[PDB]
Design an enzyme around this catalytic site. Structure first.
Site, PDB file in Angstrom:
ATOM      1  N   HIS B  37       4.960   2.966   1.260  1.00 15.48           N
ATOM      2  CA  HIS B  37       4.241   1.884   1.054  1.00 15.48           C
ATOM      3  C   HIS B  37       3.333   2.787   0.699  1.00 15.48           C
ATOM      4  CE1 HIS B  37       5.222  -1.182   3.496  1.00 15.48           C
ATOM      5  NE2 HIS B  37       6.153  -0.141   4.159  1.00 15.48           N
ATOM      6  N   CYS B  84       0.546  -2.463  -2.397  1.00 14.09           N
ATOM      7  CA  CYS B  84       2.247  -1.779  -2.434  1.00 14.09           C
ATOM      8  C   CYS B  84       2.966  -1.908  -3.652  1.00 14.09           C
ATOM      9  CB  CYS B  84       2.831  -1.576  -0.860  1.00 14.09           C
ATOM     10  SG  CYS B  84       3.997  -1.080  -0.698  1.00 14.09           S
TER      11      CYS B  84
HETATM   12 CU   LIG Z   1       6.328  -1.353   0.807  1.00 14.61          CU
END
Ligand SMILES: [Cu+2]
Ligand code: HEC
Lengths: 250, 99
Positions: B37, B84
């Site tokens: 992430h 992200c």
């Molecule tokens: Cu992600």
């Protein structure tokens, strides 16, 4: 990612035999699977999946920078077969599985296992610990030959869940004509102006960072013509195996 | 300002995905499930100039482990927009409303 197929495909095997990851993971790369020829009831066995790739390969990370590859996998076993419990996992195979978390595709599908994204240079070969079922313990399982399907991926996908392309794919001209201008972006990326002299229309094609175009100002481009090179160095592969659930007698 | 990427089973979304801070506060991006992430600030919704690589992540520093966090010390006043990297078209994105 393995979660994209789980969240939107009920069962990851299509009617044509295609694994759902091939819907967004469009490059084809070889996948291998080693499983024992036959196994006894209530025994732990290992399913070894290989997702091979050239290690000096650098892909386009979602921010334009170049980076390493990530691997993922989807194991489809027959009904009855499931992930071996930790108490039945020997220590010689405990160091083999590293510290991966195998998840079930859906909570009711305990015969579909997913893993990933995991580091490529570390898990090019994955070992899934499976527990073979017992027929005298499940009236739907029987001694017989059963199919095992695997899907293996390495690399960033080209399509998102909403149908948007990512920056890990080719960018094609939305219209034919001559390129009138190429605006090199300050933080990376490009703005390409196309003069469709045929329809008297001007169109602006936007190209993301991490991609190099193979087009020059004053060049004639056709509709769908590739505007930059394809920066995809990964791929998805599919494999198959057959296992023999053997009767302990003969 | 504590943002935890990933819910508790498989929810890819910044939580929260929009907070307000000031010059001197610290932002955090702890990833739980659905890694990596790693977030990267883009230069399309930034108020002042500055480089995006100064407030974004690199290719070697990725948040793939469940415990790593990306802290960004912002001092300029304005509204930033990070997302992200491994999920920009997915739908999990946040923004720093520092003022
Ligand atoms: Cu992600
Ligand atoms: C479209 C909805 C997809 C499906 C279905 C699957 N994947 Fe995917 N995957 C997709 C994208 C667009 C991306 C890139 C995200 C980003 O911005 O970086 C990914 C990425 C992966 C990765 C990580 C790649 C890397 O970091 O190098 C893996 C390992 C991966 N996907 C595996 C995978 C498998 C096995 C799937 C089938 C179960 C699968 N993906 C489905 C898009 C889509």
């Amino acid at each position: 990612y393995p979660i994209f197929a789980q969240q939107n495909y009920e069962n990851p095997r299509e009617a044509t035999g295609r694994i759902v990851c091939a819907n967004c993971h469009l490059a084809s790369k070889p996948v291998d699977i080693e499983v024992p020829q036959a196994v006894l009831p209530d025994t732990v066995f290992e399913a070894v999946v290989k997702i091979p790739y050239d290690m000096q390969l650098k892909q386009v990370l979602a921010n334009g920078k170049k980076g390493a590859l990530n691997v993922g996998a989807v194991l489809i076993l027959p009904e009855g077969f499931e992930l071996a419990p930790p108490d039945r996992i020997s220590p010689e195979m405990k160091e083999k599985i590293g510290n991966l978390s195998f998840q079930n595709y859906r909570p009711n599908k305990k015969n579909i296992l997913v893993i990933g994204p995991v580091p490529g240079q570390k898990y090019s070969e994955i070992t899934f610990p499976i527990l073979a079922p017992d027929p005298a313990t499940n009236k739907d399982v029987h001694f017989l030959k059963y199919p095992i399907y695997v899907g293996g991926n390495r690399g960033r996908g080209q399509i998102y869940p909403d149908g948007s392309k990512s920056n890990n794919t080719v960018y094609n001209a939305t219209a034919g004509g001559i390129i009138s201008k190429i605006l090199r972006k300050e933080k990376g990326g490009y703005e390409i102006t196309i003069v469709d002299a045929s329809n008297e229309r001007q169109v602006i094609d936007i190209i993301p960072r991490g991609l190099e175009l193979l087009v020059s100002e004053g060049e004639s481009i056709k509709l769908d013509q590739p505007l930059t090179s394809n920066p995809n160095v990964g791929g998805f592969g599919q494999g198959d195996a057959e296992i023999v659930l053997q009767d302990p007698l003969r | 300002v504590e943002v935890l990427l990933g819910g508790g089973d498989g929810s890819l979304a910044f939580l929260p995905g929009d907070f307000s801070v000031a010059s001197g506060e610290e932002i955090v991006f702890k990833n739980n499930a659905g890694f990596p992430h790693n977030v990267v600030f883009d230069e399309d919704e930034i108020p002042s100039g500055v480089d995006a690589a100064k407030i974004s992540m690199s290719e070697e520093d990725l948040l793939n482990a469940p415990g790593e966090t990306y802290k960004v010390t912002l001092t300029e006043k304005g509204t930033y927009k990070f997302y992200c990297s491994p999920h920009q078209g997915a739908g999990m994105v946040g923004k720093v409303t520092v003022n």
